[PDB]
Amino acid sequence: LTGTGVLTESNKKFLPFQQFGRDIADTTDAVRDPQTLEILDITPCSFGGV
Amino acid sequence: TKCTLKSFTVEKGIYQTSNFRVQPTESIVRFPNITNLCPFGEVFNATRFASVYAWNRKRISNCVADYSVLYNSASFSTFKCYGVSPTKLNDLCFTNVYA
Amino acid sequence: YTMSLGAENSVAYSNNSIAIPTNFTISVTTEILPVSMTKTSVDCTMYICGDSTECSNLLLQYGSFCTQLNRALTGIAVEQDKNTQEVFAQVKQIYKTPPIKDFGGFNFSQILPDPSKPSKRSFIEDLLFNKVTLAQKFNGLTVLPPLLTDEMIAQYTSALLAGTITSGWTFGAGAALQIPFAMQMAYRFNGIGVTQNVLYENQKLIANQFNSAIGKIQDSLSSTASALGKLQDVVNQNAQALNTLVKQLSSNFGAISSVLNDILSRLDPPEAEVQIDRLITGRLQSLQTYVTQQLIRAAEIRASANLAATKMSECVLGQSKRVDFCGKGYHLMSFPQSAPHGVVFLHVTYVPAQEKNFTTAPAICHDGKAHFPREGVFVSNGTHWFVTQRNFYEPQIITTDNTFVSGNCDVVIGIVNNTVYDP
Amino acid sequence: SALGKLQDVVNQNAQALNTLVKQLSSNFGAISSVLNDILSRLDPPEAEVQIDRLITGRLQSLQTYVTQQLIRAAEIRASANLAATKMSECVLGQSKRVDFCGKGYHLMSFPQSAPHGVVFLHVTYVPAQEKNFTTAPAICHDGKAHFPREGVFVSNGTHWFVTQRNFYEPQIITTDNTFVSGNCDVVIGIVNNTVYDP
Amino acid sequence: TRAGCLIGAEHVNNSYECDIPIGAGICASYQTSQSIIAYTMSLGAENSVAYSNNSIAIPTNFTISVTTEILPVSMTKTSVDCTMYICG
Numbered sequence: 130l131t132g133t134g135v136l137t138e139s140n141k142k143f144l145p146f147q148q149f150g151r152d153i154a155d156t157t158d159a160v161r162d163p164q165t166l167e168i169l170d171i172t173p174c175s176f177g178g179v
Numbered sequence: 180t181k182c183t184l185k186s187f188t189v190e191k192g193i194y195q196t197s198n199f200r201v202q203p204t205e206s207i208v209r210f211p212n213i214t215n216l217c218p219f220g221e222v223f224n225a226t227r228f229a230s231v232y233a234w235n236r237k238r239i240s241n242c243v244a245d246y247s248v249l250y251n252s253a254s255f256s257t258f259k260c261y262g263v264s265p266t267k268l269n270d271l272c273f274t275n276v277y278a
Numbered sequence: 279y280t281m282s283l284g285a286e287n288s289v290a291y292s293n294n295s296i297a298i299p300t301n302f303t304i305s306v307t308t309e310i311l312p313v314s315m316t317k318t319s320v321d322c323t324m325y326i327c328g329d330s331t332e333c334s335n336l337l338l339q340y341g342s343f344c345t346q347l348n349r350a351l352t353g354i355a356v357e358q359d360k361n362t363q364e365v366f367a368q369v370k371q372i373y374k375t376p377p378i379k380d381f382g383g384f385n386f387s388q389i390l391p392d393p394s395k396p397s398k399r400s401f402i403e404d405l406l407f408n409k410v411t412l413a414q415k416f417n418g419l420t421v422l423p424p425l426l427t428d429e430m431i432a433q434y435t436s437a438l439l440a441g442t443i444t445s446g447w448t449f450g451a452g453a454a455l456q457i458p459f460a461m462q463m464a465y466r467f468n469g470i471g472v473t474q475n476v477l478y479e480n481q482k483l484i485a486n487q488f489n490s491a492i493g494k495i496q497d498s499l500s501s502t503a504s505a506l507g508k509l510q511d512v513v514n515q516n517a518q519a520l521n522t523l524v525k526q527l528s529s530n531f532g533a534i535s536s537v538l539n540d541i542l543s544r545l546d547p548p549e550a551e552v553q554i555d556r557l558i559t560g561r562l563q564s565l566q567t568y569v570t571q572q573l574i575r576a577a578e579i580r581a582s583a584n585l586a587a588t589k590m591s592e593c594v595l596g597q598s599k600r601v602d603f604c605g606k607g608y609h610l611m612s613f614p615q616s617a618p619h620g621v622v623f624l625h626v627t628y629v630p631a632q633e634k635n636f637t638t639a640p641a642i643c644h645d646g647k648a649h650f651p652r653e654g655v656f657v658s659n660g661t662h663w664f665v666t667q668r669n670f671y672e673p674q675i676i677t678t679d680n681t682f683v684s685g686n687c688d689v690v691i692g693i694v695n696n697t698v699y700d701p
Numbered sequence: 702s703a704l705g706k707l708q709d710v711v712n713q714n715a716q717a718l719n720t721l722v723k724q725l726s727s728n729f730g731a732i733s734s735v736l737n738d739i740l741s742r743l744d745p746p747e748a749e750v751q752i753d754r755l756i757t758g759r760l761q762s763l764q765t766y767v768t769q770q771l772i773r774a775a776e777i778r779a780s781a782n783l784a785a786t787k788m789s790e791c792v793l794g795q796s797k798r799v800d801f802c803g804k805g806y807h808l809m810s811f812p813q814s815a816p817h818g819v820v821f822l823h824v825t826y827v828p829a830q831e832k833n834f835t836t837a838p839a840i841c842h843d844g845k846a847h848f849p850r851e852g853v854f855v856s857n858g859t860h861w862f863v864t865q866r867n868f869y870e871p872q873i874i875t876t877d878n879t880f881v882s883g884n885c886d887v888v889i890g891i892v893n894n895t896v897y898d899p
Numbered sequence: 900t901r902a903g904c905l906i907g908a909e910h911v912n913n914s915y916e917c918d919i920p921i922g923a924g925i926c927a928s929y930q931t932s933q934s935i936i937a938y939t940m941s942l943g944a945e946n947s948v949a950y951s952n953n954s955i956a957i958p959t960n961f962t963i964s965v966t967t968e969i970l971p972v973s974m975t976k977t978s979v980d981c982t983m984y985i986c987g
């Protein structure tokens with residue numbers, strides 16, 4: 130999955146079959162980094178509109 | 180604010196603007212540790228292929244798929260990909276492959 | 279069931295019968311209206327372009343459509359501000375809450391703000407605040423905080439309550455005029471059509487009835503927990519609209535997938551415009567539907583808030599002659615209290631209780647000259663005629679001061695022979 | 702400053718129209734923004750897709766324009782109703798409503814036409830220079846509790862007088878100014894004072 | 900603020916009428932040199948009335964006042980010619 134943004138660490142637990150997760154709007158809530166098992170989620174560069 | 184209003188003149192008040200002031204500065208790439216070239220079994224170079232009534236399906240797992248060697252090895256007359264573009268296909272990771 | 283039209287009642291009309299009430303009841307009626315809705319704003323870049331590399335170019339192509347949509351949402355939000363400004367900001371002159379003193383023997387401890395409480399909300403306002411109940415930031419839809427917070431809205435309601443109790447209608451008209459509360463109630467009885475002696479003779483009974491009605495409102499509000507349903511409906515509708523929008527985020531919209539990241543990753547732009555345009559055009563159309571549903575809701579609550587503003591300026595500020603507008607019955611006053619996303623009204627009103635039949639005549643001929651009552655109607659107890667006001671049975675002897683002389687006795691229909699006293 | 706509110710409406714109107722001009726500029730996913738070009742460099746059978754994409758985007762901008770107009774129309778309709786109510790209640794008649802036709806007691810109004818609007822010139826009463834007085838709800842004389850008929854009982858502290866609520870015009874307590882009802886014991890706040898009968 | 904963080908204006912303890920609706924009890928204006936000022940809500944002037952059960956206030960003078968009330972009536976009538984729009 131390709132994107133633009135910042136990456137923030139998190140401790141969201143996941144089911145055994147899928148380390149990757151999807152949000153309730155089916156957006157990627159968190160995708161696990163391949164080399165490092167730490168949970169890393171995408172946060173936009175643009176926060177709530179100024 | 181001028182970009183949002185699409186006018187050089189701006190009136191008095193508060194406005195909400197579309198946020199595109201941030202520009203990308205670097206590109207980072209993360210893929211899992213697999214340095215193994217694919218045990219294709221020379222499926223492309225295999226001496227005998229399957230008949231069409233009994234077609235053979237082979238699982239591909241735990242390798243890094245490189246098509247550059249295949250293009251050098253042989254010229255393919257038909258290369259049609261559906262759902263995934265033929266270009267930037269080498270950028271993308273594939274979940275499960277059954278050739 | 280077949281829907282019940284109402285209780286069947288009969289009126290025995292006659293050309294010589296009148297019905298005059300002899301006893302009355304002071305009642306308090308609770309009326310709930312909405313003022314403003316939870317303000318919603320859209321981050322155009324996030325919804326159309328969440329973490330997409332080429333979406334900046336797409337923002338140039340389709341962003342303007344969203345920019346217009348945002349202007350509409352901004353308009354709705356900004357309109358909501360005048361809604362509160364059209365309700366709680368009729369009089370900008372803020373009055374200090376007076377120390378609790380004797381108010382005609384009336385009790386206003388529940389509706390007045392509590393100085394012991396750190397919040398300026400009154401006890402009834404605390405009950406309504408508690409009774410009303412209640413990822414999106416990542417989605418790209420955000421909630422705008424209100425321009426007027428609940429504390430200063432409660433301060434506005436407290437100032438208007440203090441003005442209404444201590445000055446009558448005069449606080450709106452420039453500098454206020456401090457008045458006793460019993461005199462204001464008597465003057466409002468004079469406005470309804472009841473003489474001023476009725477209150478001052480029956481002050482304790484009216485005070486006890488008002489206190490009992492206030493107590494009945496207190497417990498009923500807490501026990502029923504259904505009066506605030508209308509306000510909850512507005513909160514529920516806002517929650518539904520948002521939830522239905524974020525559920526519309528979920529579907530793939532007749533494309534390859536519902537995630538634009540995989541659309542960008544799997545495809546290469548020349549065959550990818552088709553998929554990305556179906557996705558973002560469907561998202562923009564869902565946004566367009568959202569705006570329309572918000573627009574009709576905004577109009578609905580604007581109409582309700584205009585009604586609430588008219589109840590600010592015509593019920594709260596002064597007595598309104600219109601019947602069935604300010605509560606039910608003849609309207610004496612109305613107390614406004616703030617509420618989460620709305621306002622609530624306690625209408626103090628006058629209701630006749632015990633009526634009696636009497637024999638009536640349009641006029642009295644005494645010395646060959648016709649007499650007509652200046653105020654009130656003529657009644658008969660059976661032996662001696664009397665003149666009385668319309669909404670209460672107060673018998674008065676017919677004097678030359680009570681009636682005026684006009685015309686002659688033959689042309690009028692239904693006149694009766696009776697004597698007219700002269701002092 | 703006062704005329705600014707109307708100007709805003711015009712600017713709001715103008716703003717909407719401006720957007721639609723820009724909204725015709727966007728290609729909306731077409732190969733070319735101008736429809737003459739897609740007609741010129743494309744044979745029809747696949748060009749109809751570009752055509753209905755472009756005109757679908759244009760129509761989309763049209764129904765958004767319609768909606769934005771409808772909310773503005775609603776705001777105008779509400780203002781129109783208010784203005785017609787002001788005409789039928791503040792100008793042609795006198796209004797007992799307070800803060801509906803201006804601050805203070807409303808005397809009358811003058812309407813004046815305005816470009817895309819109207820202004821109301823409210824002539825109104827404002828009390829000023831208020832003064833303290835000592836009051837009683839009723840006056841007892843000869844066992845009769847007289848109640849005031851069209852005014853208040855006030856006192857300069859030497860004699861009691863009757864006057865109007867919105868202006869200080871004291872008058873001597875006469876039998877014509879008051880009406881007799883009940884007895885003096887039942888009323889709270891009774892004050893002994895003679896009543897002078899003409 | 901409760902709305903967020905405001906940068907570029909100085910907050911004042913003095914209360915003025917809202918010109919730009921920042922929100923959450925904050926509003927901005929342009930005033931004196933000339934700069935953007937931010938302030939809390941001016942709920943209004945504070946006037947104290949003293950209730951007494953035997954007192955009454957009567958004005959002794961009257962002021963005739965003329966007040967502006969500006970109300971919109973209509974906007975510009977806008978139409979579209981259809982075919983020359985969608986087709987050119």
Ligand SMILES: *[C@@H]1O[C@H](CO)[C@@H](O[C@@H]2O[C@H](CO)[C@@H](O)[C@H](O)[C@H]2NC(C)=O)[C@H](O)[C@H]1NC(C)=O
Nearest residue numbers: 300301302303304482483484486487490631632
């Ligand atoms: C009018 O109705 C009221 C009811 O509110 C009557 O007041 C009651 O009077 C009886 C007899 O003195 C008492 O036992 C009750 O306690 C009173 N009720 C209340 C609430 O105080 C009043 O008497 C009625 N007036 C007439 C003339 O019938």
Ligand SMILES: *[C@@H]1O[C@H](CO)[C@@H](O[C@@H]2O[C@H](CO)[C@@H](O)[C@H](O)[C@H]2NC(C)=O)[C@H](O)[C@H]1NC(C)=O
Nearest residue numbers: 379380383384385386387388401489492493496
């Ligand atoms: C006005 O009503 C309030 C009701 O809240 C009265 O306050 C209560 O008074 C009783 C005394 O009989 C106490 O037992 C309660 O604890 C009080 N409740 C609260 C919330 O304070 C108040 O006394 C009434 N005022 C008058 C003058 O009687």
Ligand SMILES: *[C@@H]1O[C@H](CO)[C@@H](O[C@@H]2O[C@H](CO)[C@@H](O)[C@H](O)[C@H]2NC(C)=O)[C@H](O)[C@H]1NC(C)=O
Nearest residue numbers: 636637657658659660661662663664673674675
């Ligand atoms: C109608 O009112 C008159 C006036 O009060 C009543 O006449 C009085 O009746 C009582 C008892 O019958 C006498 O003690 C009074 O002397 C009468 N007054 C006068 C001036 O004569 C009359 O009784 C009432 N009738 C009814 C049916 O209530």
Ligand SMILES: *[C@@H]1O[C@H](CO)[C@@H](O[C@@H]2O[C@H](CO)[C@@H](O)[C@H](O)[C@H]2NC(C)=O)[C@H](O)[C@H]1NC(C)=O
Nearest residue numbers: 642643644645646647687688692693694695696
């Ligand atoms: C009311 O009184 C008048 C007189 O004061 C009555 O008028 C008289 O009626 C009788 C019967 O028709 C005539 O013979 C007289 O000539 C009338 N007198 C005058 C001066 O016109 C009248 O009838 C009485 N009304 C009732 C209902 O008894």
Ligand SMILES: *[C@@H]1O[C@H](CO)[C@@H](O[C@@H]2O[C@H](CO)[C@@H](O)[C@H](O)[C@H]2NC(C)=O)[C@H](O)[C@H]1NC(C)=O
Nearest residue numbers: 855856857858859860861862863871872873874
């Ligand atoms: C209250 O009003 C009365 C009535 O005018 C005042 O009495 C007058 O006082 C003046 C000044 O001494 C005399 O010239 C008048 O003859 C008095 N009139 C009457 C009818 O007695 C009284 O002075 C006023 N008191 C105050 C404190 O203002």
Ligand SMILES: *[C@@H]1O[C@H](CO)[C@@H](O[C@@H]2O[C@H](CO)[C@@H](O)[C@H](O)[C@H]2NC(C)=O)[C@H](O)[C@H]1NC(C)=O
Nearest residue numbers: 840841842843844845885886890891892893894
């Ligand atoms: C007003 O005058 C009445 C009588 O002229 C006063 O009433 C008397 O008051 C005294 C003392 O309280 C009692 O002993 C008498 O029995 C009362 N008589 C009557 C007929 O009620 C009354 O006190 C006076 N009020 C004021 C404020 O001075």
Ligand SMILES: *[C@@H]1O[C@H](CO)[C@@H](O[C@@H]2O[C@H](CO)[C@@H](O)[C@H](O)[C@H]2NC(C)=O)[C@H](O)[C@H]1NC(C)=O
Nearest residue numbers: 827828829830831869958959960961962963964
């Ligand atoms: C009520 O107020 C008006 C002003 O609004 C007063 O008129 C002023 O009177 C003084 C003294 O006669 C003059 O010097 C001023 O020029 C007047 N003002 C105007 C605008 O003409 C009037 O005197 C006040 N009335 C009372 C009873 O105090």
Ligand SMILES: *[C@@H]1O[C@H](CO)[C@@H](O)[C@H](O)[C@H]1NC(C)=O
Nearest residue numbers: 163164165166211212213214
């Ligand atoms: C991947 O392999 C490199 C050596 O090529 C090693 O340094 C690194 O720690 C490995 N990472 C993982 C995922 O174990």
Ligand SMILES: *[C@@H]1O[C@H](CO)[C@@H](O)[C@H](O)[C@H]1NC(C)=O
Nearest residue numbers: 221222223224248249252253
């Ligand atoms: C396939 O076989 C040929 C010889 O027949 C060889 O030259 C070519 O490199 C092979 N390609 C591969 C490695 O699949």
Ligand SMILES: *[C@@H]1O[C@H](CO)[C@@H](O)[C@H](O)[C@H]1NC(C)=O
Nearest residue numbers: 290295297632633634635636
């Ligand atoms: C008046 O008389 C009618 C008919 O006799 C009766 O039905 C009605 O109840 C009476 N009104 C009252 C208040 O008793």
Ligand SMILES: *[C@@H]1O[C@H](CO)[C@@H](O)[C@H](O)[C@H]1NC(C)=O
Nearest residue numbers: 291292293294295691692693
């Ligand atoms: C009232 O109506 C009755 C109906 O029978 C009639 O007999 C009587 O004359 C009427 N009285 C008057 C004063 O109209």
Ligand SMILES: *[C@@H]1O[C@H](CO)[C@@H](O)[C@H](O)[C@H]1NC(C)=O
Nearest residue numbers: 830831832833834949956957
């Ligand atoms: C009335 O008397 C009080 C007593 O202190 C005073 O504060 C107030 O200003 C007076 N009001 C007028 C109008 O004279």
Ligand SMILES: *[C@@H]1O[C@H](CO)[C@@H](O)[C@H](O)[C@H]1NC(C)=O
Nearest residue numbers: 380382889890891951952953
């Ligand atoms: C007014 O209050 C005082 C005490 O503050 C009391 O003595 C007096 O009786 C009261 N008068 C009325 C009419 O309530």
Ligand SMILES: *[C@@H]1O[C@H](CO)[C@@H](O)[C@H](O)[C@H]1NC(C)=O
Nearest residue numbers: 909910911912913914938939
């Ligand atoms: C304004 O309020 C702040 C709040 O902390 C205070 O520190 C400051 O001294 C006040 N300024 C003035 C001039 O009162």
